[PDB]
Subunit: 224 residues, 2 copies
């Protein structure tokens, strides 16, 4: 087949999508699985002044595989506003609704040249892109598998389960992975006991990202 | 009929359930709608040393209607652990799984003496109480209407919509209300534009709690 595609969403902005995506792509590349990082939509940016956005960090990693890549090759809709993409678009670019059909074509083109195409969303699954589509809808259009990154703070149980409920209600392969900090041992006392119980009782377990690079690469590449 | 019952859940712990519940009960009581505040399950407490838990604050308000109330009349399962109730129960009281049938009876008894019985949950909708039941399941057993309090920070759109999706998928009347801080005008710039759009497109709109005391009292009391 052409390259596999993995969408990365999260419980929350700042949960760890970009960090975990970069660590996963680094691992995949080190294993000989040629992997590109894309950020098709990004808010809260000012490219004239700042070169540390998600798409910039992705570009730096990606140029280890293709020196010719530029920011516009890997990120397509970029806004100054810190808001959902739909709202930034309506305010900053009212004449140009985000075209997810076009994005689906651009992203799928990278499956020609890469074994794995990692696509970071913005915000969370329900975050609106257009009047009709949210980030989950975009992932469904892409026919990507899904990796949902969770925070490791109090309340992760609820956040993970709300996303589990939404994901299991739609027709896509997914995994939920906790982005665990190593100074955080409260996790192991407070939340982990329930993650363990849940995993005995669920066919799709919640994993810890940092323990799961091999299984997540396997997940991303499996099947058609 | 006997008194109505309103369950109060949230996007997150610390979202505002207790503050908003107390403000709603105060408003209801001031309007002649006799209203009790209950906290059947509470974690993170130490009643030997601290008298500022949710059940304590509820008790103070409630004693304006019944001097005879004590903490044990309004809160039934209390744990030291900061965790989901299921986990606190397994650790601190392994022989006594939380009995939601018993809680349903105790809570419904207050519908004899009150026009409105407000029941604050713990944690979020998906937070586990027993191996089989979460907070939403408990609310469904209670046949309560639901008020879900949202935080007013970045990411509220996603959190509200994840809860909307879960709630609209089950057979209960609900409202989602944002607990807005008055020093927060970023809300109006960043999130409100989407709340407005959503509300044009949804039969069940997301409201701002502070604007909505009358409509929420109406909601709580309507119908059977
Ligand atoms: C950590 O937590 C912050 C947010 O992480 P990031 O990986 O960008 O999260 P994301 O917003 O979900 O993509 C960063 O400063 C990281 O270094
Ligand atoms: C505010 O934010 C904190 C948490 O609010 P609270 O009403 O207790 O939220 P809850 O945990 O959702 O019940 C408190 O210190 C309030 O005064
Ligand atoms: Mg971010
Ligand atoms: Mg990011
Ligand atoms: Mg609290
Ligand atoms: Mg509370």
């Amino acid at each position: 087949f052409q390259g596999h595609m993995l969408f990365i969403s999260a419980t929350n902005t700042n949960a760890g999508k970009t960090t975990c995506a970069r660590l996963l792509a680094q691992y995949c590349n080190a294993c000989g699985v040629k992997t590109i990082l894309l950020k098709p939509i990004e808010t809260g940016v000012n490219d004239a002044i700042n070169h540390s956005s998600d798409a910039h960090l992705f570009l730096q990693d990606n140029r280890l595989l293709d020196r010719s890549l530029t920011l516009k090759d890997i990120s397509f809709y970029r806004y100054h506003k810190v808001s959902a993409p739909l709202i930034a678009q309506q305010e900053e670019d009212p004449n140009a609704p985000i075209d997810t059909d076009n994005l689906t074509q651009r992203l799928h083109n990278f499956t020609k040249t890469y074994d794995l195409v990692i696509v970071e969303g913005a915000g969370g699954l329900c975050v609106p892109i257009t009047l009709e589509e949210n980030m989950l809808d975009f992932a469904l259009k892409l026919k990507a598998k899904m990796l949902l990154i969770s925070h490791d703070n109090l309340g992760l149980i609820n956040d993970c389960l709300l996303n589990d409920f939404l994901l299991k209600s739609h027709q896509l392969d997914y995994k939920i992975a906790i982005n665990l900090k190593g100074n955080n041992t409260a996790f192991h006392s407070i939340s982990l006991p329930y993650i363990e119980l849940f995993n005995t009782r669920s066919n799709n377990p919640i994993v810890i990202f940092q323990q799961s690079l091999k299984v997540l690469m396997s997940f991303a590449l499996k099947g058609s």
